[PDB]
Design a protein around this nucleic acid. Structure first.
Ligand SMILES: C[C@H](CCC(=O)NCCC[N+](C)(C)C[C@H](O)CS(=O)(=O)O)[C@H]1CC[C@H]2[C@@H]3[C@H](O)C[C@@H]4C[C@H](O)CC[C@]4(C)[C@H]3C[C@H](O)[C@]12C
Ligand SMILES: [Mg+2]
Ligand SMILES: [Mg+2]
Ligand SMILES: [Zn+2]
Ligand SMILES: [Zn+2]
Lengths: 333, 1362
DNA sequence: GCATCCGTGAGTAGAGAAGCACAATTTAACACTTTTGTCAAG
DNA sequence: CTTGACAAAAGTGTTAAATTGTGCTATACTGGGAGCCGTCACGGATGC
């Protein structure tokens, strides 16, 4: 029932590496990676293609072509088959090197909890940085693995928080900007003994910052609120029960639109057969789209000035009719 | 076409992808700057649809002419924005995940198919244990591995990779063994360590290298950053590298030629492997898996002879094959999905049928559970592997909205966070798989993916609920949205908020008619606004509707002509008034609204009882029926003046109460005097002479010669009621003085008030002769008499005249109560002089108990019981003294008059005011020894008030918990009987029940006539099944039993001419999905045969549930609940399983009752403290209770049969309502009991496809048997089953109603797998779909009725047949 | 048979916590025609 | 009813700044954290 305890038990079955074992595994990965490069230069295929084929055999269990490429590599002579062996051992050493450092990520990941990601999310993201650490680690520098791996494990956790801890994703540059603003404000708060103002925070931030920018950054940093947040002691009301839907038209709005449509077509009946057609075509009352005097000059074969000539004349006659009946002004609001 | 059925089934991964308009690949929702949806996110317009109508995301298209077109740039279809409420997405999972409903809903559907327990399924699904799919010839602990075997992580690693362990050495020591030495278990590798396993031992990191040169040894040191490149014993030529290092300076090259010897290993790794030395190239490589006989290195010369994984060694020049097997064992839903894909349902069914023949009952029962699941998949066409998800459906974004509020902040649903977690974990798994991450990392990610799917579907079902950071609130998952009281079914489908509705405080409308209510004008303007806008446009108030609405927006712009138009709007229309809680149907009634100034609704006094409404702050909801159907239904079926009788009992529910009774009682009660009572005269003139001198009072009972009369009867003889009332108006006589009045041609010796009451009824009904027969003149008008008058007027005159009579009684009742002079003073609570005598007498006997207690004549408990009995008797005597004092000395006392008339108060409450408060109970339930000797008039002491406070708090706490229990019981009753509708006139059955007119009584051991109210509750309104001849009257078969017929049967029962009445009942009705008109009888609310289409099941549930809070709560409401739940009574009585003669054998150790028969000897080991109700020699029937207590309904079913338990359940439930005076007709219980006996259990399948022990409806097996008999096959043998209302409701065919009641996950899980098709038979299903319910006007029996005038009819006729 | 853990259910209204470097992608400011729309001319 | 020609409006192609995405830091660091609690009865299964 406890996924965290289950994971810790799983990583507890891989013993920690001694320094001699750490160097041997680190050496094999570098030798294996170099062996893959030598193989590709000779066999002519993609270096990335070969490492997947070598990795597939080590892991075990397109499968059609993996055997074909693996058989081709084994078809090489004795001198070239040797480089395949280091590639196999190097990939196997990489798997064991990663497995024996799964305790390091847990120690690092526990320092990042409470920042929007669960503990298991932090570990898995930290594992991704650990895998990248193995690829970029160099044992020639005689530095221990934990010294260099810690940088990549912390890097992967930080990037995941900046990318996955918010419902509305915010880029890393703005997340690091939001983090700086809070740190600066907190430092000003403890020194001034009160909540800093936006002018005070902007001045402490440095050049290019004013109270307007601080307020906009805080506005951006506002997390969305849950629609299922309860109100009151009783568990029978939420925020969503008090938020009206402003997208769908109301029955009143739908009705007055229909009322306007039938009164407008009734007024257009007084117009001529062609004069009413032009307005319905120019205003998009038929096709739904406003057409140009040109797009209308092709439907009827008339000049762009013909339309503008009558379209106004039909418009003027509706103005006279409206002033005589006044059955259309109330829709104007 | 019309929707007639709703089918639920499992969704295949292909079907889920068919629903989706695109795959949601990113967890992004909207841009933080533009606030517009992100591409490939949870709100993408390219997947779910445009944000606004007919506009693409880019903006190229913004018109409706491009409907159906997808923009080439943005990729968004140009269509209506409402498609975002319907268009779904999907998430392509990297690995399959199991659906939590089919895993955790006990019993597990996946586990049942795979024969896996809950623990075994949990371990595999959540990556704790492997399950074997292909052993590949693997052996574990000497036993070969079998398919479906569960392997732990340690066991799998031994089989998959092999057995090996490294043994560290103490620093500075050397290993005894050499590199590549075949060590065994227990052999010492080093002085301080021993190898715990047998295998090849090899050095890991030799710290010291000894090279013996050929010409001298040279001992070197190996740093931890150095590696030896040559093996032990290698021939190293001069200058060849021996130990490698990062820097060439530290490289240890050989000085000359020699042989390398490794020493001081860091550790020894003993691996159970076979070593194959080689000289030429190798045909395999590290990681390759070889079987015995596979060539390894030398082109055929070297070949493996054991299963294992190859690891080529480039320094030792050997090939080591670590003994291991290529076993195919997987974890998670992927392994489970493969098992269900390879599971043959047809083969499994045959095997399970064979196990069904096993003689063990448990084996057959277990096989039935599996075979029900197997047959569900086979019949529905569902494919079992669909219970594991490959594509996760994504809810449409508008159903999980992210909306900006007026403040500016965004609000989003919890599903978006649940979806983001799944996508974040799914995307990370894809990258981890692409990077070739170790299995441990992949295992954790897959386990987290399964939990992410579980949280989205049902958060908190397994493990800790997922919560958002910063709060402990669990995220609302899909299951939470649909289930519970706040779920979709109970909050938005079975009930909704409605338009055209209002609410206000209610006040009494004394001047209103029964069909009228007072509706505020301001409310009515809002309630009828759309109608008012049309009316304003018809008049000259406004030019059009839009201008009319603007006028009403501002109060100060509303003209007075608007209010006149509002009156024309509401003319003839009715509104619906509702007060919560709506315990019965008269909680909603239709009234014609009368516009009144003010903000309060005026309510008629006579409908307050039906609403359970008073005027101490109560509020009511107002609703406007819109169409002609809705208005016609309210004006005809729901009008208050059309609903005068209670549907539960048939008694008048709209009847005089409170002041109306008191005013009518005051004028109808006669005054009694005592000035000259009992004195005798000789002539009437002498009697009048004494009255003149004041010797005798006007109403004092006297005797003239030999007849008992009074002065008023002789002094005042009135020729007509008008003259008698004229004298009252002139002050000669009072309304309560007994005089002589000639009325109806008869010389009546009554009071003018009684004569006045007769005229009230006569003028109300506009018939003087009938009204004379309807009233009881010679009695004071109290609650019961007035109720009888209303019921009798209803039968003889109908609703319309009864409504006028009710209004007339209300008017005069209120008028006379005002002028009566009825008040409450402190002296009105008269303290009898007998209270002091009783208290002193009780004190003297109290000392007797204490004196005897000190003498040892009685124990502590005997003293406690004696004191309680003493005070209980003293309390009762004071109650008699209080009412006796009122009866003889203050006949018109306010408290006495209110109690006798039935207006307010009961004798228990009157005693607490005028006598003594009485005994009080401690919080533990024990009664205090000392009672509260003071009444409320005298005033309690401080201690007495605190002592009485325990009971008051206990009663209030009981009331609060009883309402929840009563409301829960009502919902169970509704959900089990909602489908019961009167669907036909007659089902044609000849079966019936016999209502007993006599019951056994234990105190006399004989049959005693039952109470009249009890006989009426079981006989009123019922259709006679057989012809009955009683008292020379022939009651034909099919006759509806009226109240007169019931009274005739009771009179015949007292004459010994009849003992039981054969009547048709719902228990014996053969109608499918309901009852027939004949088997139901009267519509108690109309005192006439029920109309086809009435939802009597809903009425029955409300009738039973409405008085639930009035029960005192084995007693009260808990007794009712266990009876309807068919629960086994805790103090279960013991009933004889067979008939015979009981033979008691009492001993000092135990008790044993033997029911001796002709050849049967049954045994029952009754406890010592068992209250036996039978003696030796008595002949007992099967199922007869040997011991007192509640009978187990299920034991009675198997002992005596279905009819016995049905009559037991109805009788026992009735007993509870009888104790509280609640009158409930037996029909309502029998409808529920009919549903409790609806299912049966198969005992012998015969020649059918059913299973022994299978539960199905009684109708189905009877229908199935008819076809089997019609073709000569063996019919199915079955036995009756009894289940509670909860279980019966959850086993109904329709999954929509069952899912909306309880166990939504369980109901939907079984329905989807079985592919159930809801036929929309009951009321709840059509409510969910918003369809017309098949009851009332929606019933097919009346729904298709046409109406036409003669002119149109003849025109159609004359035009066709011409 | 029995004892135990898990799952289910328990009235209705209303009111209420890293920088930094650099590349890669997008936005916004320009210019540019090119296009409708329009007021003279018959 | 056509010029017609003409300015505004709109479209369009560059180019710049701005915003956003990604990689990388080398002493050594290697199994978490919060809860933990006053209901009661009821199936139903799961084993004993
Ligand atoms: C008998 C008499 C008619 C005489 C005649 O027409 N000849 C009718 C006509 C009008 C009737 C009264 C009014 O309705 C108001 C009120 C209604 C209540 O319900 C009962 C009481 C009231 C006072 C009624 C009494 C009686 O019923 C009246 C006097
Ligand atoms: Mg009240
Ligand atoms: Mg006289
Ligand atoms: Zn577009
Ligand atoms: Zn019937």
């Amino acid at each position: 029932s406890d996924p965290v305890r289950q994971y810790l038990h799983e990583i507890g079955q891989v013993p920690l590496l001694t320094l001699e074992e750490e160097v041997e595994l680190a050496r094999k990965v570098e030798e294996g990676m170099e062996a893959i490069k030598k193989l590709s230069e000779i066999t002519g295929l993609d270096p990335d293609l070969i490492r997947e084929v070598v990795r597939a055999k080590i892991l075990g269990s397109d499968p059609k072509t993996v055997e074909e490429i693996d058989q081709k590599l084994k078809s090489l002579p004795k001198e070239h088959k040797r480089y395949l062996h280091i590639a196999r051992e190097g990939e196997a050493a990489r798997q064991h090197l990663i497995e024996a450092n799964l305790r390091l990520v847990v120690s690092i990941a526990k320092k990042y909890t409470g920042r929007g990601l669960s503990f298991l999310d932090l570990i898995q993201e930290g594992n991704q940085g650990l895998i990248r650490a193995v690829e970029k680690f160099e044992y020639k520098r005689r530095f221990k693995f934990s010294t260099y791996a810690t940088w990549w494990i912390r890097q992967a956790i930080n990037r995941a928080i900046a990318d996955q801890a918010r419902t509305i994703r915010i880029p890393v540059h703005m997340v690091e900007t939001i983090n700086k603003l809070s740190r600066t404000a907190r430092q000003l708060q403890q020194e001034l003994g009160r909540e800093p103002t936006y002018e005070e925070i902007a001045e402490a931030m440095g050049p290019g910052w004013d109270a307007k920018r601080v307020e906009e950054t805080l506005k951006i940093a506002q997390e969305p609120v849950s629609l299922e947040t309860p109100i009151g002691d009783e568990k029978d009301s939420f925020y969503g029960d008090f938020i009206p839907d402003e997208h769908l038209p109301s029955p009143v709005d739908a009705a007055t639109q229909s009322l306007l449509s039938e009164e407008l077509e009734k007024a257009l009946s007084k117009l001529s057969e062609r004069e009413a057609m032009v307005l319905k075509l120019r205003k998009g009352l038929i096709d739904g789209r406003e057409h140009t005097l040109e797009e209308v000059g092709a439907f009827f074969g008339v000049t762009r000035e013909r339309i503008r000539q009558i379209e106004n004349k039909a418009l003027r006659k509706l103005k006279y009719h409206e002033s005589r009946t006044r059955k259309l002004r109330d829709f104007l609001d | 076409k019309e929707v007639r059925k709703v089918r639920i089934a499992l969704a295949s991964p292909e079907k889920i992808r068919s629903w989706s308009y695109g795959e949601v690949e990113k967890p992004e929702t909207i841009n933080y700057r533009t606030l517009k949806p992100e591409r490939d996110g949870l709100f993408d317009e390219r997947i779910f649809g445009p944000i606004k109508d007919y506009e693409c995301a880019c903006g190229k298209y913004k018109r409706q002419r491009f409907e159906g077109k997808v923009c080439e740039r943005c990729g968004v279809e140009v269509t209506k924005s409402i498609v975002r409420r319907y268009r779904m997405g999907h998430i392509e999972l990297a690995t399959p995940a199991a659906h939590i409903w089919f895993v955790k809903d006990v019993p597990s559907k996946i586990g049942t198919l795979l024969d896996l327990s809950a623990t075994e399924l949990e371990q595999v699904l959540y990556f704790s244990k492997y399950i074997v799919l292909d052993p590949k010839g693997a052996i574990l602990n000497g036993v070969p591995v079998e398919k479906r075997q569960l392997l732990t992580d340690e066991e799998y690693r031994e089989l998959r990779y092999g057995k090996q362990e490294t043994y560290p050495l103490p620093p500075g020591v050397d290993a005894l063994v050499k590199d590549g030495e075949e060590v065994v278990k227990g052999q010492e590798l080093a002085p301080g360590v021993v190898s715990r396993l047998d295998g090849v031992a090899l050095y890991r990191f030799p710290r010291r290298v000894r090279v013996e040169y050929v010409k001298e040894p040279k001992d070197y040191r190996v740093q931890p950053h150095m590696n030896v490149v040559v093996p032990e014993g290698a021939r190293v030529e001069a200058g060849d590298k021996i130990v490698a290092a990062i820097d060439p300076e530290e490289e240890v090259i050989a000085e000359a030629e020699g042989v390398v010897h490794l020493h001081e290993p860091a550790s020894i790794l003993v691996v159970k492997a076979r070593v194959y030395p080689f000289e030429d190239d190798v045909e395999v490589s590290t990681g390759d898996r070889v079987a015995p006989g596979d060539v390894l290195a030398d082109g055929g010369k070297v070949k493996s002879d054991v299963y294992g994984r190859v690891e080529v060694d480039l320094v030792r020049n050997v090939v080591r094959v670590v003994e291991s097997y290529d076993i195919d064992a997987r974890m998670g839903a992927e392994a489970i999905q493969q098992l269900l894909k390879e599971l043959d349902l047809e083969a499994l069914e045959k095997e399970l049928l064979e196990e069904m023949k096993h003689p063990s009952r448990a084996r057959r029962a277990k096989a039935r559970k599996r075979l029900e699941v197997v047959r569900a998949f086979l019949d529905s066409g569902n494919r079992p592997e669909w219970m594991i998800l490959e594509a996760v459906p994504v809810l449409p974004p508008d159903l999980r909205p992210m909306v900006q509020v007026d403040g500016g902040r965004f609000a989003t649903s919890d599903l978006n966070d649940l979806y983001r977690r799944l996508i974040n974990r799914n995307n990370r798994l894809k990258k981890l798989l692409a990077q070739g991450a170790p299995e441990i990392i992949i295992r954790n990610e897959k386990r987290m993916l399964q939990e992410a799917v579980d949280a989205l579907l049902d958060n908190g079902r397994r493990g800790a609920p997922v919560t958002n950071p910063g709060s402990d609130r669990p995220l609302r998952s899909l299951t939470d949205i649909l289930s519970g009281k706040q779920g979709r079914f109970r909050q938005n489908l079975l009930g909704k908020r409605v338009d055209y509705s209002g609410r206000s405080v209610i006040v009494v409308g004394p001047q209103l008619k029964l069909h009228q209510c007072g509706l505020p004008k301001r409310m009515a303007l809002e309630l009828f606004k759309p109608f008012l806008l049309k009316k304003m446009e018809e008049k000259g108030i406004a030019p059009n509707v839009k201008a009319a609405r603007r006028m009403l927006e501002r109060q100060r712009d509303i003209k007075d002509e608007v209010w006149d138009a509002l009156e024309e709007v509401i003319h003839g229309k009715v509104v619906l008034l509702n007060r919560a809680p709506t315990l019965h149907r008269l909680g909603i009634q239709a009234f014609q609204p009368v516009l009144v100034e003010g903000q309060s609704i005026q309510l008629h006094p006579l409908v307050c009882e039906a609403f359970n409404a008073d005027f101490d702050g109560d509020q009511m909801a107002v609703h406007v029926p819109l169409s002609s159907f809705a208005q016609a239904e309210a004006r005809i079926q729901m009008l208050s003046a059309h609903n005068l009788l209670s549907p539960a009992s048939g008694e008048p529910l709209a009847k005089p109460s409170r002041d109306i009774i008191l005013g009518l009682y005051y004028i109808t009660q006669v005054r009694k005097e005592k000035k000259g009572a009992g004195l005798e005269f000789a002539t009437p003139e002498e009697a009048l002479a004494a009255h003149e001198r004041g010797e005798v009072a006007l109403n004092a009972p006297i005797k003239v010669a030999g007849r008992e009369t009074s002065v008023g009867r002789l002094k005042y003889v009135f020729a007509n009621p008008d003259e008698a009332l004229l004298a009252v108006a002139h002050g000669i006589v009072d309304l309560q003085d007994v005089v002589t009045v000639r009325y109806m041609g008869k010389r009546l010796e009554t009071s003018p008030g009684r004569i006045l009451f007769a005229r009230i009824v006569a003028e109300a009904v506009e018939d003087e002769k009938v009204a004379w027969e309807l009233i009881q003149l010679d009695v004071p008008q109290e609650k019961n008499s007035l109720k009888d008058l209303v019921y009798q007027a209803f039968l003889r005159l109908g609703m319309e005249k009864t409504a006028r009579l009710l209004d007339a009684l209300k008017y005069y009742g209120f008028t006379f109560s005002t002028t009566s002079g009825i008040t409450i003073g402190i002296d009105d609570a008269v303290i009898p002089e007998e209270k002091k005598q009783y208290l002193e007498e009780a004190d003297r006997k109290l000392l007797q108990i204490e004196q005897a207690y000190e003498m040892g004549f009685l124990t502590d408990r005997e003293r406690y019981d004696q004191i309680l009995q003493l005070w209980t008797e003293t309390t009762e005597k004071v109650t008699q003294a209080v009412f006796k004092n009122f009866e003889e000395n203050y006949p018109f006392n306010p408290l006495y008059v209110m109690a006798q008339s039935g207006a307010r108060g009961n004798p228990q409450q009157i005693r607490q005011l005028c006598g003594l408060r009485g005994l009080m109970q401690k919080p533990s339930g024990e009664t205090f020894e000392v009672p509260v000797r003071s009444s409320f008039r005298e005033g309690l002491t401080v201690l007495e008030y605190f002592i009485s406070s325990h009971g008051a708090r206990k009663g209030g706490a009981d009331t609060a918990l009883r309402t929840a229990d009563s409301g829960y019981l009502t919902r169970k009753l509704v959900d089990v009987t909602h489908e019961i509708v009167v669907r036909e006139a007659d089902c044609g059955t000849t079966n019936y029940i016999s209502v007993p007119l006599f019951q056994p009584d234990e105190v006399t051991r004989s049959l005693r006539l039952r109470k009249r109210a009890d006989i009426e509750a079981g006989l009123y309104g019922r259709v006679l099944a057989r012809e009955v001849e009683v008292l020379g009257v022939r009651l034909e078969e099919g006759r509806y039993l009226s109240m007169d017929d019931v009274h005739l049967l009771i009179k015949a029962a007292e004459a010994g001419e009849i003992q039981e009445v054969p009547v048709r009942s719902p228990l014996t009705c053969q109608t499918r999905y309901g009852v027939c008109q004949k088997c139901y009888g009267y519509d108690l609310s109309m005192a006439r045969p029920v109309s086809i289409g009435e939802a009597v099941g809903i009425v029955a549930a409300q009738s039973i549930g409405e008085p639930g809070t009035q029960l005192t709560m084995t007693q009260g409401l808990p007794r009712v609940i266990e009876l309807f739940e068919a629960r086994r009574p805790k103090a279960k009585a013991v009933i004889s399983e067979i008939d015979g003669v009981v033979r008691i054998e009492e001993t000092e150790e135990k008790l044993s009752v033997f029911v001796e028969s002709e050849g049967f000897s049954k045994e029952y080991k009754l406890p010592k403290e068992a209250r036996l109700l039978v003696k030796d020699g008595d002949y007992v029937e099967a199922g007869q209770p040997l011991t007192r207590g509640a009978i187990d309904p299920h034991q009675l079913l198997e002992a005596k049969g279905p009819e016995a338990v049905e009559r037991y359940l109805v009788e026992e439930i009735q007993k509870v309502y009888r104790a509280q005076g609640v009158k409930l007709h037996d029909k309502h219980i029998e409808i529920v009991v009919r549903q409790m006996m609806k299912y049966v259990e198969v005992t012998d399948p015969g020649d059918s496809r059913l299973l022994e022990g299978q539960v199905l409806e009684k109708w189905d097996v009877e229908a199935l048997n008819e076809r089997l008999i019609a073709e000569g096959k063996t019919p199915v043998a079955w036995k009756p089953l009894l289940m509670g209302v909860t279980k019966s409701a959850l086993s109904t065919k329709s999954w929509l109603s069952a899912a909306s009641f309880q166990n939504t996950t369980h109901v939907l899980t079984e329905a989807a797998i079985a592919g159930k098709k809801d036929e929309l038979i009951g009321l709840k299903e059509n409510v969910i779909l918003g369809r017309l319910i098949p009851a009332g006007t929606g019933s097919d029996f009346v729904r298709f009725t046409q109406v036409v005038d003669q002119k149109t009819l003849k025109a159609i006729e004359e035009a066709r047949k011409e």
